[PDB]
Amino acid sequence: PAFRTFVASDWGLTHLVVHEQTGEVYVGAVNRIYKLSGNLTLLRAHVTGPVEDNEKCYPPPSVQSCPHGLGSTDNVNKLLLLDYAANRLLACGSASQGICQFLRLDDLFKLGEPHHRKEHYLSSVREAGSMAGVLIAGPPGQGQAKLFVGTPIDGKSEYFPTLSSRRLMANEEDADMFGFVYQDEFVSSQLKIPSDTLSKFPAFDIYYVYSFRSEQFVYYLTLQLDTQLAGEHFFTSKIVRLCVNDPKFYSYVEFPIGCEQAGVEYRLVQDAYLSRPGQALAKQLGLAEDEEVLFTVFAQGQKNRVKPPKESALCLFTLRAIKEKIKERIQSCYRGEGKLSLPWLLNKELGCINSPLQIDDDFCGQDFNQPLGGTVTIEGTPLFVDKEDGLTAVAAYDYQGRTVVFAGTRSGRIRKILVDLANPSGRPALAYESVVAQEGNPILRDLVLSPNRQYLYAMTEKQVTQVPVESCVQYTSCELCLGSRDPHCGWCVLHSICSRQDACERAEEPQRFASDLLQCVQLTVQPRNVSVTMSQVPLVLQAWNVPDLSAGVNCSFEDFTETESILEDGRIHCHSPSAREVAPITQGQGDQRVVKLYLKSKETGKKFASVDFVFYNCSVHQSCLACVNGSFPCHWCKYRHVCTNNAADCAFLEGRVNMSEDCPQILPSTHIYVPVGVVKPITLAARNLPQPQSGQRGYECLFHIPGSPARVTALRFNSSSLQCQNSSYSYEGNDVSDLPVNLSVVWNGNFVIDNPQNIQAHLYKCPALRQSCGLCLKADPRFECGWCVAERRCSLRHHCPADSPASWMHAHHGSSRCTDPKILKLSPETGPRQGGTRLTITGENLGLRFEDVRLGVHVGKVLCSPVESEYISAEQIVCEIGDASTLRAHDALVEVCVRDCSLHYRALSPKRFTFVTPTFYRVSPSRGPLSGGTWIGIEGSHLNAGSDVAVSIGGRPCSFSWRNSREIRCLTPPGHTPGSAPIVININRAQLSNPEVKYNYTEDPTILRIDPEWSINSGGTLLTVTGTNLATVREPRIRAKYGGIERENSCMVYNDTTMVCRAPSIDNPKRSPPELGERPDEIGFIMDNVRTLLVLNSSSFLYYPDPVLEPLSSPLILKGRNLLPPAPGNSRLNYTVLIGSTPCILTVSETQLLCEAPNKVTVRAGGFEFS
Ligand SMILES: *[C@@H]1O[C@H](CO)[C@@H](O[C@@H]2O[C@H](CO)[C@@H](O[C@@H]3O[C@H](CO[C@H]4O[C@H](CO[C@H]5O[C@H](CO)[C@@H](O)[C@H](O)[C@@H]5O)[C@@H](O)[C@H](O[C@H]5O[C@H](CO)[C@@H](O)[C@H](O)[C@@H]5O)[C@@H]4O)[C@@H](O)[C@H](O[C@H]4O[C@H](CO)[C@@H](O)[C@H](O)[C@@H]4O)[C@@H]3O)[C@H](O)[C@H]2NC(C)=O)[C@H](O)[C@H]1NC(C)=O
Ligand SMILES: *[C@@H]1O[C@H](CO)[C@@H](O[C@@H]2O[C@H](CO)[C@@H](O[C@@H]3O[C@H](CO[C@H]4O[C@H](CO[C@H]5O[C@H](CO)[C@@H](O)[C@H](O)[C@@H]5O)[C@@H](O)[C@H](O[C@H]5O[C@H](CO)[C@@H](O)[C@H](O)[C@@H]5O)[C@@H]4O)[C@@H](O)[C@H](O[C@H]4O[C@H](CO)[C@@H](O)[C@H](O)[C@@H]4O)[C@@H]3O)[C@H](O)[C@H]2NC(C)=O)[C@H](O)[C@H]1NC(C)=O
Ligand SMILES: *[C@H]1O[C@H](CO)[C@@H](O[C@@H]2O[C@H](CO)[C@@H](O[C@@H]3O[C@H](CO[C@H]4O[C@H](CO[C@H]5O[C@H](CO)[C@@H](O)[C@H](O)[C@@H]5O)[C@@H](O)[C@H](O[C@H]5O[C@H](CO)[C@@H](O)[C@H](O)[C@@H]5O)[C@@H]4O)[C@@H](O)[C@H](O[C@H]4O[C@H](CO)[C@@H](O)[C@H](O)[C@@H]4O)[C@@H]3O)[C@H](O)[C@H]2NC(C)=O)[C@H](O)[C@H]1NC(C)=O
Ligand SMILES: *[C@@H]1O[C@H](CO)[C@@H](O[C@@H]2O[C@H](CO)[C@@H](O[C@@H]3O[C@H](CO[C@H]4O[C@H](CO)[C@@H](O)[C@H](O[C@H]5O[C@H](CO)[C@@H](O)[C@H](O)[C@@H]5O)[C@@H]4O)[C@@H](O)[C@H](O[C@H]4O[C@H](CO)[C@@H](O)[C@H](O)[C@@H]4O)[C@@H]3O)[C@H](O)[C@H]2NC(C)=O)[C@H](O)[C@H]1NC(C)=O
Ligand SMILES: *[C@@H]1O[C@H](CO)[C@@H](O[C@@H]2O[C@H](CO)[C@@H](O[C@@H]3O[C@H](CO[C@H]4O[C@H](CO)[C@@H](O)[C@H](O[C@H]5O[C@H](CO)[C@@H](O)[C@H](O)[C@@H]5O)[C@@H]4O)[C@@H](O)[C@H](O[C@H]4O[C@H](CO)[C@@H](O)[C@H](O)[C@@H]4O)[C@@H]3O)[C@H](O)[C@H]2NC(C)=O)[C@H](O)[C@H]1NC(C)=O
Ligand SMILES: *[C@@H]1O[C@H](CO)[C@@H](O[C@@H]2O[C@H](CO)[C@@H](O[C@@H]3O[C@H](CO)[C@@H](O)[C@H](O[C@H]4O[C@H](CO)[C@@H](O)[C@H](O)[C@@H]4O)[C@@H]3O)[C@H](O)[C@H]2NC(C)=O)[C@H](O)[C@H]1NC(C)=O
Ligand SMILES: *[C@@H]1O[C@H](CO)[C@@H](O[C@@H]2O[C@H](CO)[C@@H](O[C@@H]3O[C@H](CO)[C@@H](O)[C@H](O[C@H]4O[C@H](CO)[C@@H](O)[C@H](O)[C@@H]4O)[C@@H]3O)[C@H](O)[C@H]2NC(C)=O)[C@H](O)[C@H]1NC(C)=O
Ligand SMILES: *[C@@H]1O[C@H](CO)[C@@H](O[C@@H]2O[C@H](CO)[C@@H](O[C@@H]3O[C@H](CO)[C@@H](O)[C@H](O)[C@@H]3O)[C@H](O)[C@H]2NC(C)=O)[C@H](O)[C@H]1NC(C)=O
Ligand SMILES: *[C@@H]1O[C@H](CO)[C@@H](O)[C@H](O)[C@H]1NC(C)=O
């Protein structure tokens, strides 16, 4: 399927609304207002735009001449409101001091556009969506239609009211339009900004986000400025209310609003949506049917209303609960308690006047204690929190009780949330996510469900998108359908599709529609496994949770065949396909084919229920073991040497194998030893070896040697023993002494007998791997291979002459001392005098038992105790050296005495082991942060000695890296308390100290300010960073996370407080920063192990896009977009235009580059380059 869509050809869009009768969609935009069909085809386009004008001008040029220069500017649709009563559309713009338009409902015919009087002007403000309001009407002749409307003011306090109650006459040409409901010289149905409050706080302003009529009132969710929170701008999100029938404006109330999630504040409204909850949420939230509810979206903190944070939270307010907070607050001021507390309105705080009254929800305000504020900020019930992708918009609706919530994202995605706090579940769960403008066009607050409530029109900066509330057809299986949980979806069993109740034909009937996973179709077949050779087999089918199929059913194994079935009891009876049909499937897939046997219903003609059905083919098994000891019923024919399902297909009666133990198989004996180049027979045992029959040859042994494969014919003595005949074997290499070889026993040329234990023949050569007595007697007693004195080499008795009765020596049981031990080399060459070192000696002709080498090892005089486990016989001894403090020598040769220190049986090391006492004198940072993670460089002498090393700062262990004669490098642990700390290094049994060389733990550095608060996509600009203890980190660097990519860059420390840093590149071909600017996912600094500095919560650092540049005595002029960003303060890019190597003196402008040239051209700005 494809998502129905309307694209914004030229400009940005601002507002959308749906006509409750027609389903026509009206769309407010900059310079345009469109009418669209339900499926988003363009129906009519109104030009409202580019108008010659100027914001500074009061009454706009039409009425009076203005001395300020005029220019063609864009007219932003600020507001849009459906007036069904007068068959039209209020289409309120800007850029004319905010004059309002009336477009006729069905053709967009301008009925009127009043702009003579001062009330016809709404606000200079050119910002979209900072305005809102509601249209409310009575019948013609009675109290006429009124408009309640909030807008920002931009400091034009005396020109416009922020909130107003205005008149809507039936004639659009009538001059009375947008006049106040009741005007007096004392009090008018409007609320102005006081001049005193603008003098005190310079640019205070009220931005109106959402607005709705409820019962008899009118609410507004608003954003205001710092007035008890001159300084900087911080915003407070509040609710406002009025009685509809209060011309005096005395009912005004104003409570701060937000919500908290695990100690994180969310105080900035982005959107809201009044709705119903339906039976579900209502009940367990404790409400009556017609009781209302308010879904909202808030961003984290109270910072940057112009560009809020990603961190966003969807909260909830029951209107009964806000009504109680307002009633509770009024029944409180009418007790005379405290002040009114409304900073921006009343600068000098007037007091609450006590009085006896019946305080009701019907209370519409009175003369004294007047317009009043709120102290207790109203907290909301949180539902879902996005941390990587900011929520932007919301809607909700009642579906068959269950409450579905819709949530726009900064990405251009919509979430479909069942709110389940009042529902059984642990917390409200996301059901589904969907895509609109994937590239990252944010969704806008104006997000309306259709009248039929089948779709949801989702608006972006650049496109409207008809997203269906229900799209269950994406669900392929009963198990996934009812698994998604998004409540519109059910499994329409007989159609085998997923959709709503009203879409499944005959759903009302028994078992025809499934709503809980337990209703899903469950199927089983009695003969699950059927052989390829069988045909038309009777199968019984048990199925549960299925409607009456007396309509008829067919069995289809897949889209290959289809057999008719008859019904009896609670079971279905159909037949397997014919052999003629079965094999066309199984051909190719060999061993077996699992196939999804369906049921095709006669009523629908769609497959719905399935099972795993197995088609097994015995024949493809090419050994007895696979055939019988497999998973299936298969018979093996000893004599034909073929696997098949039919007993009769076997050679004859006494050659059928049905049991795995009766297989023709080779049994193991104690290992098959085969010397190279020696004539030997190889007797084998086995079981049930076949008597070769008519036209069948005898047995052979085939040896799979990569060098040479030998074919030797054999004799089968009985059903249980074989023997390959006298022959010699070889391999070409002399590289490995012991080579195990795969052997296959064949008869009649190609019939290979089964080898389960996979018995091998070991071809051994008397050593091509061992030129030392110790190595030979080390190897198997099986080989018979032994060491022969005279030759100075090792071979069997067979291959070595007996000149003496004891000239050939073999390790009898290992009780064989071995001559002329030799040491090749030993590791650690140096060691500490205290000992404890593990000496690692590697020789060639050592002793064959441990208990003879133990006590034999010595380092000069020093007794060395050898280790059992780490000792590899006659190749290697691992030995632990004892205390060498008392030794006079500085270095000594190593000695091994095999068992006795006999004159021929002693070895002495070619180079000698050295004793030292390592010392240290300096550390190369002597200071570091308390969190630790500092790269320490301990300088000294003999530091590479011994085996183990352990460095302890304050008793706590250092993470070791590498060791040297002169240096030890390790990474510091966290310190307990800041200040001087002892450094203890222990090498084996030597523990060396120095109280003159200490390590000073410092208080963790802090980051305060980065100065410019921005950079470009490729980075590379200077950043003037300030903080504390910055000299205590030697190599600090900046870190930034943009999208799925993390990047780093260098810093240069100057003071303990100052640092210059080069901004990190975020160059991503997936995302590019917008012209407006964008915060990174994360920004911080890498400073050792101080991890709180890796991620900066309070940071407002922005990233702008890299410059766009156009290629091919008079000066150089280089044109292009994005040359200068809208940045705070002075701070701009240090551009340098160069020619081969020579820089020029240039003046930089927003679209052009004014270099100067005397007549290969490169432009640089930070880490950016272009030609
Ligand atoms: C269940 O599975 C079985 C087995 O997997 C399968 O039966 C196979 O059916 C296909 C037909 O599509 C056969 O494949 C074709 O074979 C053509 C020639 O067959 C000759 O060679 C056979 C192979 O001998 C090998 O196997 C034996 C024993 O393991 C081994 O000792 C040998 O060394 C050798 O490797 C041989 O079995 C066969 O003799 C059969 O037929 C006679 C007469 O009916 C019967 O008496 C025997 O008992 C025996 O069953 C015969 O001599 C060949 O033309 C063709 O090859 C061409 O096409 C391919 C692919 O395009 C090209 O790559 C190639 O270059 C050729 O141009 C093709 O391979 C296959 O031989 C059957 N398998 C067997 C064991 O016979 C069925 O799908 C399933 N059974 C059912 C009932 O559905
Ligand atoms: C051809 O088929 C055969 C036979 O089916 C198959 O044989 C396997 O051989 C390996 C050896 O390589 C066996 O591994 C051994 O396991 C020994 C313990 O066996 C007991 O426990 C088994 C596992 O118990 C779990 O699973 C079962 C069933 O799922 C469950 O009931 C239990 O609760 C538990 O979760 C169990 O399978 C087994 O029961 C078998 O035998 C009985 C009696 O015949 C029969 O009733 C069952 O039907 C079933 O076949 C039994 O209860 C373990 O002790 C052993 O290690 C020792 O023995 C060796 C040799 O004696 C010593 O050298 C060694 O030092 C140890 O002392 C070994 O690890 C494996 O269990 C066999 N598998 C089966 C299914 O029987 C081959 O794999 C097949 N070969 C080929 C080439 O296809
Ligand atoms: C440790 O070392 C560091 C430096 O390594 C040091 O930090 C600087 O210290 C020096 C003095 O030693 C200060 O420089 C003085 O600035 C005086 C005027 O200040 C104005 O101009 C500043 C510099 O402009 C440069 O940088 C900007 C931005 O990068 C750039 O656009 C320009 O092109 C230009 O190159 C400017 O930063 C500063 O703005 C500060 O103040 C505002 C508002 O209060 C604040 O919001 C900012 O955050 C910012 O801090 C301001 O506009 C100037 O008069 C003075 O010149 C005298 O001294 C020189 C040399 O001794 C004499 O030759 C001359 O006759 C003058 O008497 C000098 O240039 C600089 O302000 C510090 N930097 C910062 C960021 O604070 C630490 O102080 C050192 N610690 C010590 C000394 O213990
Ligand atoms: C291929 O397709 C076939 C479909 O027919 C599948 O065969 C079925 O396998 C399952 C197990 O894999 C069997 O369930 C078991 O049933 C036994 C009781 O068996 C007795 O009753 C059977 C039905 O009433 C009957 O068919 C049996 O008779 C057979 O055996 C005789 C003698 O060998 C033979 O002559 C006949 O021809 C029959 O073949 C027999 O009297 C039951 O004891 C099992 O429970 C045990 O195991 C479980 C799990 O470990 C354990 O929890 C219990 O405690 C208990 O120990 C088990 O339920 C089923 O009976 C088979 N159906 C038939 C018709 O034989 C087969 O699975 C498919 N093959 C593969 C590889 O998938
Ligand atoms: C281990 O590491 C710690 C931390 O690095 C060391 O402590 C630091 O010592 C340095 C020496 O280089 C100090 O700098 C000097 O500060 C003194 C005056 O110190 C006073 O002022 C400080 C800054 O305003 C202030 O932080 C101090 O207060 C601390 O102590 C109290 C009480 O214990 C505590 O309650 C506080 O919380 C503070 O922690 C203190 O009142 C000054 O004389 C020096 O000035 C010289 O240099 C300047 C500039 O060049 C020059 O103009 C002058 O003429 C003069 O020559 C110098 O600034 C630093 O303040 C200490 N930092 C911390 C965090 O304590 C500690 O010494 C190390 N141990 C060892 C054994 O070396
Ligand atoms: C404007 O939007 C409207 C709806 O808001 C829309 O017109 C509708 O199109 C649908 C199909 O997209 C039509 O619904 C049909 O109703 C008839 C019964 O009269 C059925 O026969 C149709 O069934 C067919 O289609 C099924 C699903 O694809 C098939 O399974 C089946 O085999 C049939 O072929 C179908 O349910 C309907 O006619 C109108 N709606 C109304 C109220 O008339 C249209 O897409 C948009 N039009 C424009 C000009 O933009
Ligand atoms: C449920 O199962 C039943 C029985 O298993 C099954 O009945 C089948 O119906 C089709 C007709 O749709 C029969 O096929 C016909 O057979 C004649 C010969 O007698 C053929 O000449 C025809 O084949 C032509 O048409 C085909 C399809 O267009 C072409 O592929 C082909 O090239 C020919 O031109 C004709 O289709 C078939 O014989 C029976 N099946 C059996 C096993 O007899 C039916 O499909 C199912 N019932 C229902 C109501 O769906
Ligand atoms: C000597 O014989 C050995 C053992 O028989 C051979 O090594 C291994 O042979 C087995 C066959 O039993 C291979 O195992 C296979 O594994 C896959 C797993 O995906 C499985 O699907 C197959 O059914 C099969 O069991 C295994 O690949 C193979 N080992 C290696 C490393 O390839 C060996 O090939 C023989 N030596 C020589 C030199 O041929
Ligand atoms: C060869 O084998 C036969 C029979 O096993 C035996 O008599 C003879 O000793 C063997 N010959 C040699 C040279 O090993």
Does residue 368 contact residue 349 with C-beta atoms inside 8 Å?
no
For ligand 4, pick from 525, 526, 528 the residue to mutate: most ligand atoms within 8 Å of CB.
528
Q: Which helix (H) or strand (E) holds 285?
A: helix 278-285
Amino acid symbol at 993: S
For residue 580, how many other CB atoms are within 10 A of its CB? Answer: 8
Q: Distance between CA 671 and CA 740 in Å, rounded?
A: 10
Q: Residue 527 CA: which ligand 4 atom is closest? A: 4
DSSP reduced 3-state for 540: strand
CB 284 within 8 A of CB 423: yes
| Beta strands, E only, 206-343 | 207-214, 217-224, 236-243, 253-260, 265-275, 293-300, 312-318
Which strands, in side-by-side order, build the sheet including 1147-1148? 1116-1119, 1152-1155, 1147-1148
Report whether residue 758 contacts ligand 1, using a CB cutoff of 6 Å.
no
Give the DSSP H or E segment for 110.
strand 110-112
How far from chain centre, in Å, is Cα 787? 65
Structure tokens at 1092: 């709180």
- CA angle, corner 41, sides to 40 and 42, nearest 5? 110
* Structure tokens, 695: 């036209």
CB of 38 within 6 A of ligand 6: the answer is yes
Q: Which residue has the tokens 């509810």?
A: 293
Query: Helix or strand or coil: residue 969?
Result: strand
Specify the ligand 9 atom closest to the Cα of 726: 1
Q: What does the alpha-carbon distance between residue 369 and residue 350 come to, in Å, rounded to a whole number? A: 8
Strand 793-794 versus strand 787-788 pairing type: antiparallel
Q: Give the burial string for 1010-1023 (b: 16+ CB within 10 Å, else e).
A: bebbbbbbbbbbeb
What is each CA distance from 949 to 733, 915, 928, 961, in whole angstroms? 44, 16, 22, 11
Contact 20, 1 (CB under 8 A): no
536 CA distance to ligand 1 middle (Å): 25
Hey, how many other C-beta atoms are within 10 angstroms of the C-beta on 497? 20
Give me the sign of the Cα torsion angle 365, 367, 370, 376.
negative
Q: Separation of 1008 CA from ligand 3 center, angstroms?
A: 17
Of 1107, 1112, 1147, the C-alpha closest to 1125 is: 1107
> Under the phi-then-psi rule, with left for phi > 0, alpha for psi from -120 to 50, and beta for the rest, what region is 1076?
alpha
804 CA from centroid of ligand 9 (Å):
28
- Pick left, alpha or beta for residue 903 (phi over 0 → left; psi -120 to 50 → alpha; otherwise beta): alpha
Answer yes or no: are the C-beta atoms of 373 and 388 closer than 8 Å: no
Experimental technique: X-ray
Encoding tokens for residue 885? Answer: 């403090």
* Cβ-Cβ contacts under 8 Å for 1168 (sequence gap 6 or more): 1016, 1018, 1020, 1106, 1107
Would you call 961 exposed, middle or buried from its count of C-beta atoms within 10 A (0-12, 13-18, 19+)?
Answer: exposed
**Pocket probe mutation, ligand 6, options 39, 42, 502, max atoms within 8 Å of Cβ:** 39
Ligand 9 atom, smallest distance to 725 CA: 2
Ligand number nearest CA of 680 is: 9
Please choose from 529, 617, 658 the residue to mutate so as to test ligand 4's pocket, defined by most ligand atoms within 8 A of CB. Answer: 529
Ligand index nearest the alpha carbon of residue 798:
9
Residue in 56, 383, 394 with CA at minimum distance from that of residue 209: 394
Ligand closest in space to the Cα of 756: 2
Other Cβ atoms less than 10 A from the Cβ of 975: the count is: 20
Resolution in Å, one decimal place:
4.0
DSSP helix/strand/coil, 494: helix
What long-range pairs does 44-51 form, CB within 8 A, spacing at least 24?
44/107, 44/108, 45/108, 46/91, 46/103, 46/108, 46/110, 48/75, 48/77, 48/91, 48/93, 48/101, 49/11, 49/74, 49/75, 50/74, 50/75, 51/75, 51/95, 51/96
Query: Does 1134 contact ligand 9 (Cβ within 6 A)?
Result: no
Distance CA 587, CA 1074 (A): 59
Give the list of residues 6+ apart from residue 528 with CB closer than 8 angstroms, or none. 611, 612, 613, 614
Centre of ligand 9 to C-alpha 1069, Å, is: 79
1035 CA to centre of ligand 3 in angstroms: 24
In this structure, what are the phi and psi dihedrals at residue 642, rounded to the nearest 5 degrees?
A: -140, 150
* Closest-CA residue to 95 (of 128, 64, 73): 73
Any ligand 9 atom below 6 A from CB of 683? no
Which homologous superfamily does the CATH classification assign to the domain defined by 478-616?
A: Immunoglobulins (2.60.40.10)
Cα 1076 to ligand 3 centre (Å): 30
Q: Are 326 and 255 in contact (CB under 8 A)?
A: yes
Q: Which residue has the tokens 């650092």?
A: 1101
Q: What share of the chain is helix, strand, coil (3-state, %, to 5)?
A: 5, 40, 55
756 lines ligand 2 (CB under 6 A): yes
Residue 325 makes CB contacts below 8 A (sequence gap 6+) with: 255, 376, 378
Is residue 587 lining ligand 1, measured as CB closer than 6 Å?
yes
Amino acid at 853: V
CB atoms within 10 A of CB 1117: 10
CA distance 314 to 430: 12
User: Which three-class secondary structure state does DSSP give residue 822?
Assistant: coil
**C-alpha closest to that of 225 among 217, 216, 235, 215:** 235
- Burial (CB < 10 A; 0-12, 13-18, 19+), residue 939, is middle
Residues 6+ apart with CB under 8 A from 10: 32
Query: Quick one: tokens of 910?
Result: 């070619």
CA 363 vs CA 140, 217, 245, 287, 358: distances in Å: 27, 11, 11, 22, 9
Token representation of residue 899: 């068992």
Nearest to 80 by CA among 145, 12, 34: 34
CA 1014 to centroid of ligand 7, rounded, Å: 74
Phi, psi of 210 (to 5 degrees): -130, 165
Say if CB 606 and CB 494 are below 8 A apart: yes
Rounded to the nearest 10°, the torsion over CA 922, 924, 925, 927 is 0
Buried b (16+ CB within 10 A) or exposed e, 731-752: beeeeebebebebebbbbeebe
DSSP string covering 1025-1086:
EEEESGGG-SS-EEEEEETTEEEEEEEEE-SSSEEEEEPPP---SS----TT-B--SEEEEE
Helix, strand or coil, per DSSP, at residue 735: coil
756 CA: nearest ligand 2 atom: 82
Phi-psi domain of 332 (left: phi exceeds 0; alpha: psi -120 through 50; beta: other): alpha
- Ligand 9 atom 2: the closest Cα is on which residue? 726
- Tell me, what amino acid is at 507? A
- 432 close to 486: Cβ distance less than 8 angstroms: yes
Contacts of 960 (CB under 8 A, 6+ apart): 949, 950, 951, 968, 970
Residues 6+ apart with CB under 8 A from 494: 506, 512, 547, 601, 603, 604, 606, 608
Compute, in angstroms, the gap from residue 659 CA to the centroid of ligand 1: 27
Mutating to test ligand 5, I would choose from 1002, 1004, 1058 the residue with most ligand atoms within 8 A of its C-beta, which is: 1002
| Nearest by Cα to 1143 from 1128, 1132, 1153, 1129 | 1153
Which atom of ligand 9 is closest in space to residue 680's alpha carbon?
Answer: 14
**Which amino acid appears at position 352 of this protein?**
C
User: In this structure, are residues 1054 and 1060 in contact, taking their beta carbons and an 8 Å threshold?
Assistant: yes
Q: Is 631 in the pocket of ligand 4 (CB under 6 A)?
A: yes
Residues 776-809: b if buried by 16+ CB within 10 A, e if exposed: bbbbeeebebbbbeeeebbbbeebbeeeeeeebb
What is the token pair recorded at 1075? 């012209």
- From the centroid of its chain, how far is CA 1107? 31
Amino acid at position 355, single letter: S
User: What does the alpha-carbon distance between residue 947 and residue 881 come to, in Å, rounded to a whole number?
Assistant: 11
Out of 562, 563, 578, mutate this one to test ligand 7's pocket (max ligand atoms within 8 Å of CB): namely 562
After which residues does a break in the chain occur, C–N more than 2.5 Å? 229, 1112, 1159
Any atom of ligand 5 within 6 Å of the Cβ of 509: no
Q: How close is the Cα of 498 to the center of ligand 7, in Å?
A: 30
Quick one: which H or E segment has residue 625? Answer: helix 624-628
Question: Ligand 5: does its nearest atom lie under 6 Å from the Cβ of 1000?
Answer: yes
Instruction: Round to whole Å and give the CA distance between 407 and 415.
Output: 5
Tokens 């386009």 sit on residue: 45
| Ligand closest in space to the Cα of 505 | 6
The answer to whether 274 and 318 have CB atoms below 8 angstroms apart is: no
Q: Which two tokens stand for residue 390?
A: 């900011």
CA distance 177 to 167: 6
Ligand nearest to the CA of 622: 1
Is there an atom of ligand 2 within 6 Å of 501 CB?
Answer: no
Closest CA to 235 of 190, 197, 268: 268
The two three-digit tokens of residue 1031, written as one number: 């000299």
> Phi/psi of residue 272, each to 5°?
-150, 175
CA distance 184 to 187: 5
CB 522 within 8 A of CB 599: no
Are the beta carbons of 865 and 878 closer than 8 angstroms? no
DSSP state of 415: E
| Tokens, residue 417 | 């949330």
**Residue to probe by mutation, ligand 1, list 619, 627, 649, most atoms within 8 Å of CB:** 619
Ligand nearest, relative to CA of residue 453 = 6
Helix (H) or strand (E) run with residue 583 in it: helix 579-586
3-class secondary structure per residue, 132-197: EEEEECCCECECCCEEEEECCCCCCCCCCCCEEEEECCCCCCCCCCCCECCCCCCCCCEECCCHHH
SS3 string, 350-413, reads CECCCCCCCCCCCCCCCCCCCCCCCCCCEECCCCEEECCCCEEEEEEEEECCEEEEEEEECCCE
Instruction: Give nearest CA residue, ligand 8 atom 3.
Output: 742
What's the DSSP call for residue 917?
A: -
The dihedral built from the CA positions of residue 1149, 127, 264 and 434, taken in this order, carries a sign that is: negative
Pocket test residue of 591, 628, 629, 759 for ligand 2, highest count of atoms within 8 A of CB: 629
**Pairing verdict, β 253-260 and 378-379:** parallel
3-class secondary-structure state, position 502: helix
Instruction: Tally the C-alpha atoms within 13 A of residue 434's C-alpha that lie toward its C-beta.
Output: 27
CA–CA gap between residue 220 and residue 206 (Å, rounded): 11
What is the C-alpha separation between 745 and 736, in angstroms, rounded?
A: 25
Q: In the CATH scheme, what is the homologous superfamily, with its name and number, of domain 919-1002? A: Immunoglobulins (2.60.40.10)
Which residue owns the Cα nearest ligand 2 atom 78?
629
Cα(369)–Cα(330) distance, integer angstroms: 10
The rounded distance, in Å, linking the Cα atoms of 1171 and 1167 is 14
Q: How many Å apart are CA 474 and CA 123, to the nearest integer?
A: 48
Give the tokens for residue 1149.
């402008």
CA distances from 922 to 209, 604, 964 (A): 65, 88, 14
Verify whether ligand 1 is closer than 6 Å to residue 592 (CB atom): no
- Which of 953, 1001, 1003 to probe ligand 5 with, by most ligand atoms within 8 A of CB? 1003
Q: How many CB atoms lie within 10 A of CB 1039?
A: 19
368's tokens: 């004294």
Query: Tokens standing for 986?
Result: 């222990």
* Phi and psi torsions of 238, nearest 5°: -135, 155
Q: Residues enclosing ligand 3, CB less than 6 A?
A: 1011, 1024, 1054-1055, 1058
Mutate which of 580, 587, 747 to test ligand 1's pocket (most atoms within 8 Å of Cβ)?
587
In angstroms, rounded to a whole number, what is the distance separating the alpha carbons of residues 1160 and 1109?
Answer: 15
45 CB-near residues (< 8 Å, 6+ apart): 32, 33, 34, 35, 108
Provide the 10 A C-beta neighbour count for residue 916.
19
Atom of ligand 5 at shortest distance to CA of 1029?
5
Is the C-beta atom of 679 inside 6 A of ligand 9? yes
The neighbouring-strand residues paired with 405 are: 396, 417
Any idea which ligand is nearest the CA of 574? Answer: 7
Is residue 926 within 8 Å of residue 1031, measured between CB atoms? no
Measured CA distances, 727 to 681, 682, 765, 989 (Å): 7, 9, 16, 61
Please report, for residues 273, 314, 564, 678, 931, the alpha-carbon distance to residue 417 in angstroms, rounded to integers and kept in the order given.
14, 11, 45, 81, 42
Q: Are 710 and 683 in contact (CB under 8 A)?
A: no
Rg (CA), the chain: 45
Q: What is the spatial distance between Cα 603 and Cα 377, in angstroms, rounded to a whole number?
A: 62
Q: How many angstroms is it from 682 CA to the middle of ligand 9?
A: 11
SS3 label, residue 115: coil
What type of residue is 221?
A: L
φ, ψ at 693 (rounded to 5°):
-100, -160
Residue 909 identity: S
CA pseudo-torsion sign 459, 464, 470, 474: negative
What gap in Å lies between CA 1162 and CA 948, rounded to an integer? Answer: 57
Phi, psi of 549 (to 5 degrees): -100, 20
Alpha carbon of 598 to ligand 7 centroid (Å): 18
> Distance, CA 1081 to ligand 3 centroid (Å)?
32
901: tokens are 């220190």
In whole angstroms, give the CA distance from residue 1062 to residue 1054.
14
Q: CA 43, CA 107: separation in Å to the nearest integer?
A: 9
For residues 682 and 673, give the distance between their C-alpha atoms in angstroms, rounded to a whole number.
9
DSSP string, 70-106: PEEE-------EEETTTTEEE----SSSS---EEETT
529 CB near ligand 4 (under 6 Å): yes
Is the CB–ligand 2 distance for residue 629 below 6 Å? Answer: yes
What long-range pairs does 640-647 form, CB within 8 A, spacing at least 24? 641/748, 641/751, 643/618, 643/619, 644/533, 644/618, 644/619, 645/531, 645/532, 645/533, 645/534, 645/618, 646/533
